[PDB]
Design a protein around this ligand. Structure first.
Ligand SMILES: Nc1ncnc2c1ncn2[C@@H]1O[C@H](COP(=O)(O)OP(=O)(O)O)[C@@H](O)[C@H]1O
Ligand SMILES: Nc1ncnc2c1ncn2[C@@H]1O[C@H](COP(=O)(O)OP(=O)(O)O)[C@@H](O)[C@H]1O
Ligand SMILES: [Mg+2]
Ligand SMILES: [Mg+2]
Lengths: 374, 372
């Protein structure tokens, strides 16, 4: 139902957990806050819910400033970690609970419970106390509540945390579908980049309380704004090679690889604030390294680890030119033994470049799936 | 240090949490017990550790029957999501909860601790306290303490459960390396098939207390013994199409697709206990469906969902021929909009076939990475 944060800031004493954050969440939008451990995801949700105060800035749900408004009068529903049910209430009861304080026709009440039930996989245990173990089921009960009561805005704090990988996976699809049906605004929080990529219309990456970047999944993936975002989004982390810039041009930067071979390569990157001799970080995703049959900039090394996963093979390589190890991903099964000498290709159009301050030199290579000029 | 379970069974009253389980774990082997929620993973570890009794069958650690043996005299060390150290802190000081309290000399406690230091990536922090945050390394010292214990076998129950996805990922690599250095026996337990695939030399899949199957990751992946294993191993679940067998032969079975087109396809599968007219389940992994440029058995439908993940694209399709939706995985970015009509190819050599009882008709197509 439209949520806006304007220069919102949170301070506990003299520390700042949330620094001047500006976010514009539109109606029906599914937004995900992503970031490491204590980057401040929960604090944000809490400030939006009113379970925490906004030391500065304005919060705006719908069209009204909610800063000073009781949590129950904001039009938000929330679910988190390992939510606790009302022990005396049954699953069905612990599910129609919130939709009840909101006053609702039993027809609706039941309609929703049963719907949400046969989705979160619970219809068979509506009649039963929260001592339905499994915790993974109680958590599902916790979520259903918020789902059955359809708050104008959903605030879910790591809802899938207590589930098995298999369940966690099905739940995502379920939450996605759920979002397609009812088109309400939802702010979701995880520490798992995959959930983000999978659920969001818009992702907001948090780093130590600051907003590192905001944008569509593919935007964050093809064009991370800085090293932090670049190493946070991407199942197996992006590779980073320390390089030295040896030349610049318009819409093009040349750097030399740490290889005692010091091969120089031109990268179709921004070239803005970048001077010759500067030390930078070259970034290349494991999926984007090439088989090697494709010459032009080759890296050869010793296999340290080989992960056969059936659908793909992840190979860890030790490139003589400074340890690092380089992680490579090739599709399907690849037969290589540890200790073997493996080579791969470095594709310029696919590289990222970060200045010492960690900021990125905007990539000029057009990537599919992202609105681009031309 | 070699662990063997022979017809081990556990019963709580009249229920059976562990049913006649037979496992042969070799020296230095890294074994993972995988299964859903309460499939019985913890009970198994506990029986091996001696924190639970074996209602029947024999347990054998090394060469001796441990059934009736106190937990502390079995040569096992057990770790479970609960890393704790000492308030007096200090890496070197820690890692010796046992060594110091029992003399063991002052030259020995140093060699063990120093042998799990740089020999674990922790020598440059041996004299460092957990006051230097280090979260993932503080996991390595907790482990290190268990290690310096020199246990014959190593137990671990969902150790990565309390970590962020990012940490969870690095920890796996760490635990793998750790296993490469010291080559002790380790029995690991998860509910996450990915951790299994990534860590194990041998995986044992548990279903409601029974052992659904034992084998190398690729064995379980290319050749699941039954529908359960087939739908448990594989990031996005394997597709299942209800089919009707229309003909058999030696090392070959023909079935007809539920398509009102009822296209018939021969599958290089076992063909053992399988009669014409029988209803079966055709299994095909999302990664194994083909682009379509490759004709021969094509399925066309309406896109329901499209997941752009940067490294790959997962497309959910509605095939007219009976709902089901079919999940497809193509590498890199694929530009398709929901509602679009997309087609894919069905590769026979890659299909699985399950009898009504859920058992699999052994695939005959040779797959890479699996002996035989
Ligand atoms: N009431 C509080 N008082 C002091 N510090 C707090 C409080 N609540 C959270 N913090 C701190 O702010 C950070 C962010 O916590 P949140 O719990 O916001 O993090 P995340 O959801 O990203 O893990 C943590 O480092 C935490 O110690
Ligand atoms: N002390 C106990 N008393 C009765 N049943 C138990 C006990 N411990 C475990 N169980 C049963 O065994 C099953 C498996 O639990 P474990 O705790 O073995 O499972 P997992 O680690 O796979 O979640 C549960 O479904 C539960 O019913
Ligand atoms: Mg939190
Ligand atoms: Mg357990």
């Amino acid at each position: 139902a439209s949520v806006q944060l304007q220069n919102v800031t949170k301070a506990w004493g003299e520390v700042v957990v949330s620094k001047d954050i500006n976010l514009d969440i539109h109606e029906g939008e599914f937004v995900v806050f992503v970031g490491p451990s204590g980057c401040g995801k929960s604090t944000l949700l809490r400030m939006i819910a009113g379970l925490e105060t906004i030391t500065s800035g304005d919060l705006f749900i719908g069209e009204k400033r909610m800063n000073d408004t009781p949590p129950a009068e904001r039009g938000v529903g929330m679910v988190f970690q390992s939510y606790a049910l009302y022990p005396h209430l049954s699953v069905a009861e612990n599910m129609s609970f919130g939709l009840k304080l909101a006053g609702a026709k039993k027809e609706v009440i039941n309609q929703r419970v049963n719907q949400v039930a046969e989705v979160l996989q619970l219809a068979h245990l509506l009649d039963r106390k929260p001592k339905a173990l499994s915790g993974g089921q109680r958590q599902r009960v916790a979520i259903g509540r918020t789902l059955v009561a359809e708050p104008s805005v959903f605030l879910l704090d790591e809802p899938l945390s207590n589930l098995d990988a298999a369940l966690r996976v099905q739940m995502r699809i379920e939450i996605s579908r759920l979002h397609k049906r009812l088109g309400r605004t939802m702010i979701y929080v995880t520490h798992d980049q995959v959930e983000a990529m999978t659920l969001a219309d818009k992702i907001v990456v948090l780093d130590a309380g600051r907003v590192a970047q905001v944008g569509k999944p593919l935007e964050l993936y093809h064009y991370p704004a800085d090293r932090f975002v670049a190493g946070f989004i991407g199942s197996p982390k992006m590779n980073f090679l320390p390089v030295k810039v040896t030349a610049t041009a318009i819409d093009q930067v040349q750097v030399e690889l740490p290889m005692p071979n010091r091969q120089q390569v031109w990268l179709p990157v921004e070239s803005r604030d970048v001077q010759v001799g500067a030390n930078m970080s070259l970034g290349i995703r494991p999926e984007h390294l090439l088989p090697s049959d494709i010459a032009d900039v080759i890296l050869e090394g010793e296999v340290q680890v080989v992960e056969q996963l059936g659908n793909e093979t992840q190979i860890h390589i030790q490139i003589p030119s400074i340890r690092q190890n380089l992680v490579y991903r090739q599709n399907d099964v690849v037969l290589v033994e540890e200790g073997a000498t493996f080579a791969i290709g470095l594709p310029p159009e696919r590289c990222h470049l970060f200045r010492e301050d960690g900021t990125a030199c905007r990539r000029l290579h057009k990537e599919p799936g992202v609105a681009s000029a031309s």
